């Protein structure tokens, strides 16, 4: 495969970046390549581990007040485990929501306990390890077919990993858990792609399109919920419409926001873990070889290292409910605080060799699924299984699959997205 991308020397730290060249509040910065971004967070960890940044202006989104950026692992961990101080209300991105966004985006992820946990308990059983293990057959059937179709669909042995595997595998699994008919899965995926791609001109930059997509997926959720209210199915949509929280059924807004949260999170995270993982295997072939020659033994550590390496969710935001000082920086009640998982996951204070992609890494206390605590990723067991099966099917059917171009990278501060990744195999 002479068209494979260049390999890299594992363990090489990126050069640190002069602090004057770092603008977290500019979309231009998020367009820099990932070596520069990684070197910039390295500078912040060293020189300004907590620092303040203006919010990025996005068309039709309210920027509002700026935010305190926590770039060190210990601070991101602390903030995550202290939700009475670091609240998830009113929003978990840096920007402000509005009443009009709240119709569609006012889910449990932007609420504190106890209401957060009462909402989460409606669906939590479906995401537990023992229940998710039950659907291995479904994950395998879909992954196996997708990889086979990459082969059958491309006589030239060239494919886009994202559209042909990494995207459609998690999409199928979450949509089927929700109870969405197959004929509408791609419609769901287009809506979630726009919702968490906004600001990249390849996805959407007109706020009117963002609002029409949001209204359209909400109307879809409401219509499916209405069907399930009358005729139950064994799906999460039926669980949502049947549940009672504080003795009251969920409202239309609550059902639509819950539905949207689950399909967005399901569709716009694992795909990037998978795609960054194939990119990493392409750059570090010794790691591919060692996983391929002991797939079951290394899989638990390998999947977690892929998540640490990719950090598919770049950050989450909190809002202080009281004044607090951290690292000698006083922050005030009401201030926004951003938790940079991408940076925690390269912190030398926690990982001695953070720049080494090591599929055997153990322990691996990465914060790719967050810092732990009340909002710890509901889908973590699901995502780990999706990743493990995707790589197993690639190993079994096309073991030498390799990237042939550098990825087209999503322009986003929030999601470490890959839009396309050309691959080949022999």
Q: Are 321 and 335 in contact (CB under 8 A)?
A: no
Q: How far is the CB of 171 from ligand HEM (least distance, A)?
A: 10
Residue 7 and residue 120: Cα distance in Å, rounded?
A: 43
Q: 137 vs 132, 133, 235, 296, 382, CA distance in Å? A: 10, 9, 17, 17, 13
Binding residues (CB under 6 A) for ligand VD3: these are 91-93, 95, 97, 101, 105, 109, 195, 260-261, 264-265, 268-269, 313
Q: Are 334 and 319 in contact (CB under 8 A)?
A: yes
Considering the complex, state which of residue 45 and residue 416 has its C-beta at the smaller distance from ligand HEM: 416
Considering the complex, state which of residue 256 and residue 402 has its C-beta at the smaller distance from ligand VD3: 256
Please choose which of ligand HEM, Mg ion, ligand VD3, none residue 91 contacts, taking the beta carbon within 5 to 8 angstroms, the exact cut-off set by kind: ligand VD3
Our finding on whether 313 is near ligand HEM (CB under 6 A) is yes
Residue 374 and residue 120: Cα distance in Å, rounded?
A: 10
Tell me the site size for Mg ion, rule CB under 5 A: 1
Our finding on whether 120 is near ligand HEM (CB under 6 A) is yes
Q: How far is the CB of 83 from ligand HEM (least distance, A)?
A: 9
Q: How far is CA 93 from the centre of its chain?
A: 13
Q: Are 319 and 87 in contact (CB under 8 A)?
A: yes
Q: Are 31 and 411 in contact (CB under 8 A)?
A: yes
Alpha helices in 134-235 (DSSP H): 136-153, 161, 168-178, 185-195, 207-230
Considering the complex, state which of residue 75 and residue 386 has its C-beta at the smaller distance from Mg ion: 386
Going by C-alpha positions, the residue among 13, 6, 9 that lies closest to residue 348 is 13
Residue 161 and residue 369: Cα distance in Å, rounded?
A: 23
Q: How far is the CB of 195 from ligand VD3 (least distance, A)?
A: 5
Considering the complex, state which of residue 383 and residue 390 has its C-beta at the smaller distance from ligand VD3: 383
Please choose which of ligand VD3, Mg ion, ligand HEM, none residue 105 contacts, taking the beta carbon within 5 to 8 angstroms, the exact cut-off set by kind: ligand VD3
Among the listed residues 32, 166, 307, 411, the single contact to ligand HEM using CB under 6 A: 307
Q: How far is the CB of 404 from ligand HEM (least distance, A)?
A: 24
Structure letter (DSSP) for residue 112: -
377: annotated binding-site residue? yes
Residue 288 and residue 277: Cα distance in Å, rounded?
A: 10
Positions in 331-350 near ligand HEM (CB under 6 A): 341
- In 277-332, DSSP assigns E strands to 315-320, 324-326, 329-331
Among the listed residues 379, 407, 417, 422, the single contact to ligand HEM using CB under 6 A: 379
Positions in 155-184 near Mg ion (CB under 5 A): 176
Q: Are 179 and 241 in contact (CB under 8 A)?
A: no
* Neighbour count for residue 67 (Cβ, 10 Å): 25
Contact flags string 147-176 toward ligand HEM, x per CB under 6 A? -----------------------x---x--
Considering the complex, state which of residue 216 and residue 406 has its C-beta at the smaller distance from ligand VD3: 216
Q: Please report, as ranges, the residues that interact with Mg ion according to CB under 5 A.
A: 176
Q: Please report, as ranges, the residues that interact with ligand HEM according to CB under 6 A.
A: 80, 108-109, 120, 170, 174, 261-262, 265-266, 269-270, 273, 307, 312-313, 316, 341, 368-371, 375-379, 382-383
List the binding residues for heme. 377
């Amino acid at each position: 495969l002479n068209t494979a991308i260049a390999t890299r020397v594992n363990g090489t730290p990126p050069p640190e970046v002069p602090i004057a060249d770092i603008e977290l509040g500019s979309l231009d910065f998020w367009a820099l390549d990932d070596d520069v971004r990684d070197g910039a967070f390295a500078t912040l960890r060293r020189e300004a581990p907590i620092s303040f940044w203006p919010t990025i202006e996005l068309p039709g989104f309210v920027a509002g007040n700026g935010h305190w950026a926590l770039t060190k692992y210990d601070d991101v961990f602390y903030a995550s485990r202290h939700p009475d101080i670091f609240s998830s209300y009113p929003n978990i991105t840096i920007n402000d929501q509005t009443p009009e966004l709240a119709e569609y985006f006012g889910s449990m992820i932007v609420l504190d306990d106890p209401r957060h946990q009462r909402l989460r308990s409606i669906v939590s059983r479906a995401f537990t390890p023992k229940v998710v293990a039950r659907i291995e057959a479904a994950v395998r059937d879909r992954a196996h077919r997708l990889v086979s179709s990459m082969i059958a669909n491309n006589p030239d042995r060239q494919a886009d990993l994202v559209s042909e595997l990494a995207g459609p595998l998690p999409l199928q699994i979450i949509c089927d858990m929700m109870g969405i008919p197959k004929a509408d899965h791609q419609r769901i995926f287009h809506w979630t792609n726009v919702i968490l791609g906004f600001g990249d001109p390849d996805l959407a930059t007109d706020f009117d399109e963002f609002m029409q997509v949001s209204a359209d997926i909400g109307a879809y959720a409401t219509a499916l919920a209405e069907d399930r209210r009358v005729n139950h199915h064994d799906d999460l949509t039926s669980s949502l419409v049947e549940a009672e929280v504080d003795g009251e059924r969920l409202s239309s807004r609550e059902i639509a926001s819950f539905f949207i949260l689950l399909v967005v999170a399901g569709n716009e995270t694992t795909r990037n873990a998978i795609t960054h993982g194939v990119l990493a295997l392409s750059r570090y072939p010794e790691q591919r070889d060692r996983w391929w020659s002991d797939f079951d033994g290394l899989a638990p550590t390998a999947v977690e290292e892929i998540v640490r390496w990719a950090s598919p969710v770049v950050y989450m935001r909190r809002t202080l409910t009281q004044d607090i000082e951290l690292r000698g920086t006083k922050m005030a009640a009401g201030d926004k605080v951003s938790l940079w998982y991408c940076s925690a996951n390269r912190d030398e204070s926690k990982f001695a060799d953070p720049w080494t992609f090591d599929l055997a890494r153990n322990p691996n206390p990465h914060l790719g699924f967050g810092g732990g605590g009340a909002h710890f990723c509901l889908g973590a067991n699901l995502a780990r299984r999706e990743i493990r099966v995707a790589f197993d099917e690639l190993r079994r059917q096309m073991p030498d699959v390799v990237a042939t171009e550098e990825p087209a990278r999503l322009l986003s501060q929030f999601i470490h997205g890959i839009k396309t990744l050309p691959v080949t195999w022999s």
